[PDB]
């Protein structure tokens, strides 16, 4: 398996590390998403704790309006982060 293939599998495994803790086994509620972000994506936490901003993130990601973040919605979240990392990668040549 290539690094990219392994990376896609990490996306899947990490989701399920949290999604099965509460309620729907295959979706992230707000608490589960918060844990995932805090523990697995701490490099993306805001400078200050900010519950309002976190609520807005949850709302933004819940595209199908079911009060949960499913796997597809989570892939869109990760893509959005990757797109920012990509802007940094491309945007600052020496």
């Amino acid at each position: 398996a290539s690094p990219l293939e392994k990376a896609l599998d990490v996306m899947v495994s990490t989701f399920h590390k949290y999604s099965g803790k509460e309620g729907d086994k295959f979706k992230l509620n707000k608490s589960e998403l918060k844990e995932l972000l805090t523990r697995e994506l701490p490099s993306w936490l805001g400078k200050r704790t900010d519950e309002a901003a976190f609520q807005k993130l949850m709302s933004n990601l819940d595209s199908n309006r079911d009060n949960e973040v499913d796997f597809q919605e989570y892939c869109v979240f990760l893509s959005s982060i990757a797109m920012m990392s990509n802007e940094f990668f491309e945007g600052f040549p020496d």
């Binding site: 490099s43 993306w44 936490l45 901003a53 933004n60 595209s63 597809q72």
Partner: protein, 43 residues
């Protein structure tokens, strides 16, 4: 962590459009419309 607030919120303001794009593509793959790629994970 970041030096600012709200960057994740900013980056996800158009999540709906991206979900609709992913849904479209996933459906094409699943239905076998793009057989250069598999429709399901396989060994």
């Amino acid at each position: 962590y970041r030096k600012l607030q709200r960057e994740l919120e900013d980056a996800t303001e158009t999540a709906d459009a991206m979900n609709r794009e992913v849904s479209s593509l996933k459906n094409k793959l699943r239905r076998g419309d793009l057989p250069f790629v598999v429709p399901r994970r396989m060994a």
